[PDB]
């Protein structure tokens, strides 16, 4: 993936 919402 590109973009990991889980770290934000």
């Amino acid at each position, epitope marked *: 993936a590109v973009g990991i919402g*889980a770290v934000f």
Partner: antibody
Amino acid sequence: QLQESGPGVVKPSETLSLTCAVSGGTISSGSYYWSWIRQPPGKGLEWIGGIYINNKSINYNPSLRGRVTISIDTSKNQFSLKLSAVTAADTAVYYCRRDPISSTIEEFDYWGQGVLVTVSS
Amino acid sequence: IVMTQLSLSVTPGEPASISCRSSQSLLHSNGHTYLHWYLQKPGHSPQLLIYEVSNRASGVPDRFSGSGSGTDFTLKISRVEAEDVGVYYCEQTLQTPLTFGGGTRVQIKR
């Protein structure tokens, strides 16, 4: 970039240990999310768990939580997977993967080639 | 939390649409929507095609496109050829656990 290493064959109920060697950059980078993913032969993809920067930000698939542990070794630039009490359902190709946490970093991920692990006596 | 996506028989040169439905909205409070599409050709590791609903990854040809909203998403191949045969997976990275759809196999109809 990424290369998985495994034992080949694990006996049922024993523990599977895998390592992923990271190159081209440090595994401690805050630019990436590092995951273990697996695929039993002829089946779909399953996320095992992942890590952001260090051992204080590890998460697991609920279906594997309590049976898997993931760790990091910054000295070797590696991260690893330990899966206990393995059954034939754990026979699979195991992949490590690097995801940029933002497209601002770059617009591609990287998948290891994967390593087959077979659970059998 | 689960994503819902099976075989698609496609005449060559014709368009294909692959659907993905999520049990939860994939819209993050930061405004981004964390849904991605992969293609796995037989004997290969998966390759990222579309990240964050609609963006092609580096080097991905323009015959692939993505669209969607909240819980409903669609991957489109404009003109299907032999190199597009394989299994297409959607994935969400909104929250842990990260999750994959079950896959949609594309086969050429003849």
